[PDB]
Amino acid sequence: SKNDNHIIQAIALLDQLDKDINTFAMRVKEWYGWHFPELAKLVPDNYTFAKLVLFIKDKAXXXXXXXXXXXXXXXXXXXXXXXXXXSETDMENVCVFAQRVASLADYRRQLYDYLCEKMHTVAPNLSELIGEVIGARLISHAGSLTNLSKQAASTVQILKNKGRISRYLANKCSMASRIDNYSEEPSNVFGSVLKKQVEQRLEFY
Amino acid sequence: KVVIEPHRHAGVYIARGKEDLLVTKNMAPGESVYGEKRISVKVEYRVWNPFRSKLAAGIMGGLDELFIAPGKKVLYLGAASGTSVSHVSDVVGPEGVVYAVEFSHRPGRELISMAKKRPNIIPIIEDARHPQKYRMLIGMVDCVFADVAQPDQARIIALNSHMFLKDQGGVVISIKANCIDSTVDAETVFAREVQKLREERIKPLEQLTLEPYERDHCIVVGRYMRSG
Amino acid sequence: XXXXXXXXXXXXXXXXXXXXXXXDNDLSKMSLGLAHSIGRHKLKFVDVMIIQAIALLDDLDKELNTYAMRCKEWYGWHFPELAKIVTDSVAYARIILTMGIRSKASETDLSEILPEEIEERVKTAAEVSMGTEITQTDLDNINALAEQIVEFAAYREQLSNYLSARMKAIAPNLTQLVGELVGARLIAHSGSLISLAKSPASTIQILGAEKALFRALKTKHDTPKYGLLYHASLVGQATGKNKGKIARVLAAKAAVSLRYDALAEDRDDSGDIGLESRAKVENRLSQLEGRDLRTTPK
Amino acid sequence: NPKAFPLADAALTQQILDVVQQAANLRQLKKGANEATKTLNRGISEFIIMAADCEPIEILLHLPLLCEDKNVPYVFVPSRVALGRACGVSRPVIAASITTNDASAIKTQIYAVKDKIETLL
Numbered sequence: 001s002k003n004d005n006h007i008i009q010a011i012a013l014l015d016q017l018d019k020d021i022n023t024f025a026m027r028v029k030e031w032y033g034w035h036f037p038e039l040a041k042l043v044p045d046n047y048t049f050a051k052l053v054l055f056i057k058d059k060a061x062x063x064x065x066x067x068x069x070x071x072x073x074x075x076x077x078x079x080x081x082x083x084x085x086x087s088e089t090d091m092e093n094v095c096v097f098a099q100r101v102a103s104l105a106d107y108r109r110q111l112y113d114y115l116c117e118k119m120h121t122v123a124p125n126l127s128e129l130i131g132e133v134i135g136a137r138l139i140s141h142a143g144s145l146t147n148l149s150k151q152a153a154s155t156v157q158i159l160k161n162k163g164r165i166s167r168y169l170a171n172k173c174s175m176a177s178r179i180d181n182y183s184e185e186p187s188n189v190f191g192s193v194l195k196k197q198v199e200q201r202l203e204f205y
Numbered sequence: 206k207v208v209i210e211p212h213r214h215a216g217v218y219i220a221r222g223k224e225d226l227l228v229t230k231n232m233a234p235g236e237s238v239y240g241e242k243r244i245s246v247k248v249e250y251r252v253w254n255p256f257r258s259k260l261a262a263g264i265m266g267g268l269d270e271l272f273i274a275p276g277k278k279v280l281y282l283g284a285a286s287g288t289s290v291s292h293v294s295d296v297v298g299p300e301g302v303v304y305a306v307e308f309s310h311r312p313g314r315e316l317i318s319m320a321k322k323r324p325n326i327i328p329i330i331e332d333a334r335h336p337q338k339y340r341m342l343i344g345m346v347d348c349v350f351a352d353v354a355q356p357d358q359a360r361i362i363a364l365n366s367h368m369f370l371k372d373q374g375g376v377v378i379s380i381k382a383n384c385i386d387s388t389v390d391a392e393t394v395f396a397r398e399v400q401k402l403r404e405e406r407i408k409p410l411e412q413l414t415l416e417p418y419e420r421d422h423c424i425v426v427g428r429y430m431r432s433g
Numbered sequence: 434x435x436x437x438x439x440x441x442x443x444x445x446x447x448x449x450x451x452x453x454x455x456x457d458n459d460l461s462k463m464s465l466g467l468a469h470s471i472g473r474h475k476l477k478f479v480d481v482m483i484i485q486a487i488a489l490l491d492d493l494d495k496e497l498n499t500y501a502m503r504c505k506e507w508y509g510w511h512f513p514e515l516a517k518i519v520t521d522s523v524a525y526a527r528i529i530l531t532m533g534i535r536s537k538a539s540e541t542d543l544s545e546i547l548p549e550e551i552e553e554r555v556k557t558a559a560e561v562s563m564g565t566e567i568t569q570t571d572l573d574n575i576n577a578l579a580e581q582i583v584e585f586a587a588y589r590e591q592l593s594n595y596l597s598a599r600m601k602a603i604a605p606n607l608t609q610l611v612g613e614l615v616g617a618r619l620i621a622h623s624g625s626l627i628s629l630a631k632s633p634a635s636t637i638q639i640l641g642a643e644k645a646l647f648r649a650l651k652t653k654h655d656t657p658k659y660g661l662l663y664h665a666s667l668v669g670q671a672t673g674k675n676k677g678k679i680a681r682v683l684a685a686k687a688a689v690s691l692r693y694d695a696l697a698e699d700r701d702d703s704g705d706i707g708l709e710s711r712a713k714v715e716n717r718l719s720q721l722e723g724r725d726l727r728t729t730p731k
Numbered sequence: 732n733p734k735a736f737p738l739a740d741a742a743l744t745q746q747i748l749d750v751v752q753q754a755a756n757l758r759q760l761k762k763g764a765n766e767a768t769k770t771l772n773r774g775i776s777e778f779i780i781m782a783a784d785c786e787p788i789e790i791l792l793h794l795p796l797l798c799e800d801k802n803v804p805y806v807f808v809p810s811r812v813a814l815g816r817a818c819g820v821s822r823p824v825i826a827a828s829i830t831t832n833d834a835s836a837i838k839t840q841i842y843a844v845k846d847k848i849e850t851l852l
Contacts, residue, residue, distance in 0.1 A: 013578070083466050096588065110573075114570070278457070311476060313472050314472065321469065324465075341464070342464035345450035368446045432443070631768065688764075692789050
């Protein structure tokens, strides 16, 4: 079935989403600097800054989604004392851009979920010993899972700590990708069992 | 490699390298008022233009006491495209400010967008002939600089001298020769303007000629007394 | 009430000094904002707003293809052949939604996205294709990439719509003259509108691809003739060597048109002088294709 | 045309186009605003001559902006056909550019008339 191709496709998409959405957030932030550059330091949260750019289309009081509670008032009292210029159709297309920032960050969030889900399905020992981020990027790191198993513990590399733990944690994560490679039905318990051997050595660290 | 040197005033600097340069620390990374260059020595530094800014010309010409200081707040008039006000703000840093005045309509958006990025520059687009048209915005400046093109630069600087001058504060006035006489030799006009400028409580300390930077400019250093 | 004057110099100075005690960068920065509204209102209403729109637009074409290779390569485990028959990315992002599975393939017809030649081709691609079934967990973000690329194309339409309208706003005659995407790229290699308006006609030619220009300047070679003005909507409308000289003619009239747009305070904003130019450029083109370099015997 | 910043009189325009009439005859002269922006870039322009009644007149207005940048003198002459005939061209010319050489025959004939235009600012 037991496939590993979709995990590499999801990771290969996720890296370009992480090069796309923050880039388009800087683009929208450059646009909104000619309307309100002051809110971007108070609201640096690039999804929710592109929600508050999407929210108050013109200036500013009596706000609901500005808090959902100090950043709401800090944006209202700053938007009263306006500094930039002002037009409308440019502002509308720019708000459509911020909407695409919002939808693309949402698609990245939904990519994260099905990524960790196909992780938890096919490679649960890779997601219990480390976590779905390093584990899902690992099957891109070898290019595929069958090229993880033929790699050694030394030949694979991860991130006094570097010389010891990046070798022994690599040992158990390689052995995790072994029982993920050749099993038909892999388990989530023995991923934590092979995590616990790193846990004794790391309490020794 | 690159030698970075304190100029005769604080804030200003000098690059000694393949070529000598007058240089000045940059407040913001990576932006230009008029397209000028920059150099990292790491600390940022920006070359001033004596040929474009008469302040930098009196800075390179040899002048004793320019009152633009890193602690102090300084007024400016005649900000032609804001060629000097980023230089005044970068020579005062954040503790000092420049309050700039420019009445000509065409190049003032660059001063506005310059005050948009560097906080020490404050702009004035109100009229300087009646200086109480911008009475609400500035209060009690330390020292002034002037670059307007009116003939009564002595009297219009007097009409700002009776408003914004800190008492026992200094004053530099950058005087062009063309607006007033334009046929007779410049020193007989500069003595005339010194006679007129002693009439409004500035007793001059120095006169200085921009010979290789302008054709017959001057700056007059004095200290305004007994009013403000 | 009466108003008193001719003596308010010292009193105005004194309450100005007291306002400094009322205090200093915050009040003077509210005054900075006062000047910011009162001056930006005064001298206009820019070059800078349109110049990142073209950078975003050129990123969009690259981003569509580099997500589109992902869109095929994620779907070749269901349909290898559907990558090869339809090649456009928006048809692929539509055809994940439209075809569905190979059982939903033969049932679902394709009048909207590639019909009447490629309907037979996708019905022959559905019957034999060496890929697999793909599950309902798999059709969560395969199924969502198909509408993400659609929305990327729709946002590209918003990019082109805003560029096309604001071209008529800022440069009404040059974008009535040469085309609007060159109308972005010319200011993009320029910077300001004035930076191109201070550029002569021979620099409107070789604005983009200036390497062979420099290979012509320092090595004894010959310059390009077309340059960035090649991809404009009128240079390719000739044929052959005739496309060379027209690269001057538009770049000539561009200088007549851009400076009509960048340097006119009273302005119809209506594209006439650019169309007055384009009529003569088309007339030079129509006189140019009229000539033939062959032998015409009697 | 209210954008006529300095348009010379009948008198100084005659000497200006006299320096034009001789300046083509030494081939000391480039013709055209498109070539004027090149001569100003490479700086060998003595001064830049502009016509006033061409439609539209905005197609050369970048050159007073340029001649303030490089600090080169300039004037407005009234008519393009005069400028072309004094340049030796059969065509109308909106703008002429006198090339610089210290050894050409009309050189002081440049400088005294150039100092005429340099008076006008």
